[PDB]
Amino acid sequence: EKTAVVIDLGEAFTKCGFAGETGPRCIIPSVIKRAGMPKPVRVVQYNINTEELYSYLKEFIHILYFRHLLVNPRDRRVVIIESVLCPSHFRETLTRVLFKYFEVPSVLLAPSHLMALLTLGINSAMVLDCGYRESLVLPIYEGIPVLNCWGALPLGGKALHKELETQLLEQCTVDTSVAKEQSLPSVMGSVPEGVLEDIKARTCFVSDLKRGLKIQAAKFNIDGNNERPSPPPNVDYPLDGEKILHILGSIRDSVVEILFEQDNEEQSVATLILDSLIQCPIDTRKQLAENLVVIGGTSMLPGFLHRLLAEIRYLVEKPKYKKALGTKTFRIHTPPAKANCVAWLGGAIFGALQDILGSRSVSKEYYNQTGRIPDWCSLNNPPLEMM
Amino acid sequence: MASLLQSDRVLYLVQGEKKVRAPLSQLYFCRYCSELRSLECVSHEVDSHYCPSCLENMPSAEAKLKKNRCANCFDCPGCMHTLSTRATSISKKAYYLACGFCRWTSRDVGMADKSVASGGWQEPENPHTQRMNKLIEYYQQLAQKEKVERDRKKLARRQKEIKIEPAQAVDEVEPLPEDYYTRPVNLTEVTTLQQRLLQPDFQPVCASQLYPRHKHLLIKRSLRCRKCEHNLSKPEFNPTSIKFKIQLVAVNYIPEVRIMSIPNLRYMKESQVLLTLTNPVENLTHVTLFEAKVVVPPKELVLAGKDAFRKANKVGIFIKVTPQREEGEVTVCFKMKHDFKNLAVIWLTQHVELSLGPLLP
Amino acid sequence: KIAPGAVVCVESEIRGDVTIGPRTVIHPKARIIAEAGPIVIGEGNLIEEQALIINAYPDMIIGTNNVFEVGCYSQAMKMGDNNVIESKAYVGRNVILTSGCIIGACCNLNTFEVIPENTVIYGADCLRRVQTERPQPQTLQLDFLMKILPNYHHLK
Amino acid sequence: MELGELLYNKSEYIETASGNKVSRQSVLCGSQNIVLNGKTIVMNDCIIRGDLANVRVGRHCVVKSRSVIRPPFKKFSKGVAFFPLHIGDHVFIEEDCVVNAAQIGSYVHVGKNCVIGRRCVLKDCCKILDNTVLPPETVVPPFTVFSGCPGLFSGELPECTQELMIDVTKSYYQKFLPLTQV
């Protein structure tokens, strides 16, 4: 039998490929590219007239299949959820576009946090999955994932662009093609995201905490108490337009301090795991502390994890979680496959799943008969097995 | 030529599962059922795979095994252009890859010269491949036991255990090296986000680790009518051939309408638009036009066989158009009835939409 | 001023104070306009058809063995040695090209930048790639130019 | 598309025995080596370099103004090889094009301000879009579209392009009439 397909889903939109582990991971960032449109158009929007979407998936799907991957779509169907929280559109719509445009011969749909543990051989919690927005923490038990201890933040990195557009604009020399120093704004009213990104992609990094905090002291120059150290060296970014964007070495340092500010807001990038452990059964915390899993492209941001853990550990001493939990370590389990890759692999794994797959799958027929696909959030999930 | 001849102003409606309006030059005519068909309404099949650079043909089974990639050709990670193999004589031929466009060479990343022109360039294997293979075998054994349990439960209502060691967690994550805090960053030495994503198995940070990837193969597509399952377009299997086995393009069966001159169009003002109707066949073809408001001549026009004015197999006709909108583009629709000789007399009625352009004030 | 061994075509349009270095060849329809100051062309330079070199006021020293392909437009104040400007490339007024630079076809160098040695500028986005391998010393392309330039054009 | 009569000043173009319409401003270098097959039109300031290698132009070819047709040279360590430049039938080359191809096939349309790399081979019914830069030794397969800087494969052309190309090239020459004084 032929296995299997893997879908774009967020930072993940770039994750087009097909099973097994050998597939290309074709990079689609994914947009249309419709001629009459300003390009590109991101067609990946919630709260969208579905029609608009309809026509978009139709066309994307058509496209991806059409070209991009050899697919011969009638034989392989997988939809990964990288969402649990996807609203019913568009899922309804996704199916809806199948289904009839695309005749779909049963489909199994599955979440990332389960596809996550598949690789470590671990059937237990914690999974933190961070990438395009809205970040999710979800202890997975052996077996049930447990939603009741459900947590979510931005960003992950979508907001880094405001933080960066802004800051780029708060620094400010562009050395324009006329050798003039000019304002960014106004030579440009905006910085396209691709710039922002590029700059980010290669320039942002996460500092060690003892000094991550002096970076914070720059904001807070209290009564002169600043102990924000000299920045690294400045960078001439060449900018397109035959412009040069000079960048302070100091921004590399600040952008990443969003992730980590403590306002009167909780420092949540850092909890999540902590606000959930307090929520979790005591009888399982023993596994959850200690056994942590981090997937998602944004943890490719270097030094992230350093702090991260330091922070967390740091925080474990805040009484509030301390008295509440007592302490212990944390150990990271990590695959060797890259952070982005674990969803993708656990999609490959799934071809193994063929004896099961067509069983735990939602039938085409059913759907043809009702068209109802269960949601965990519905009062009528039909027992599909009636069929 | 379709964009040079403004074929986009004259659209023909295809009646199928989806209503599609497109230029006649982009449409196919099915001689077996005598119906017009769009590219969207027909079925697309994979005929063959080929490399656009070495022009090697790949069978569909071979393309599946090789993940639809060319084994000898690579994409330059510098500009995405295909690399060429070059030889130098050493006091023996030594081969290296180079791009003619951006001047990138395999030496830029420290790759040693090869004794063979092709086949010596290999991609790094995934270090964790064996780990995935053991995990897959483990879950397959569990899936077999779980399947049997489900079959027993359904019937009632009507093997050395693979031990896998869990991944060892790391107690301490590698800290950021001190070099990143004070070292000047060279933006030319580090790979861009797009260049990193081209190698998703390990995503190199440094340009020296940015290995060339195998070139993607292209596909020759065949088109078939869904209603009668007959082929409308079939190229030959060999990618180097310009010949087609079947070419049933609509422009050879249905009279082709073109706009020659458009008058100054004004709101509610009758204006005469000059169209040309061309008979695509060697036989005499009879065409009658039926009804912005458009008024067409009520008389049947006879077009000469393919060997305002009459010249051979084309006649220039004026139609009267009265724009009904105060602003926007002036569009008119009419039905074109003509006789068809089915060599595979039928009267066919084609819905034709004309885009005349913006209304003048 | 034509140096001994330089080939200047009768169809070449030269205006102003222009010095042509030895073994330089100027193809038909080339336009060299020295309005703001003298243009100094070094030895072994090749200027092909439709090449436009203008030294204009803000309303020029060209090194040795440089190649100007068809339809190139160069306003540079200073060029180094062994540079190649591909067809329809534009080099702006304040561009400083050092030695061993390659500018790809249809690239627009409007930036106030000193291009470092061994830089290849290619693509619509004018991406600068520092060549990490010594570009093969153009001694091989200079040997062909020195033997081919005197043989394919009617030396005056 | 009412292909209007491309009325030219009758004094500016010389009509040859083979029906070629060549502007007086055209630059023909090595004319003994330049073979223009019948019904060819060569516009103003076109440069054809036949001094060192033969240039062969097919039937119904149209070369627009300031186009430079130059055969590619291959430098070997023991000498320079002169390659003839072969252009097929019904080839239409837009304005400001630089052609260094070894061979251009029949029914080929080269877009405006395009740069073709040395020793490129363009097959029959090829389309190159405006402002496209083809790297040296690029081979364009039949019914393929390349565009951009660098010029990359964007997609294939429908087979119907050949039928359209036949009528346009023949009509273009028929519409290219001497300016009959009104």
Ligand SMILES: [Zn+2]
């Ligand atoms: Zn091969």
Ligand SMILES: [Zn+2]
């Ligand atoms: Zn390249």
Ligand SMILES: [Zn+2]
């Ligand atoms: Zn039918």
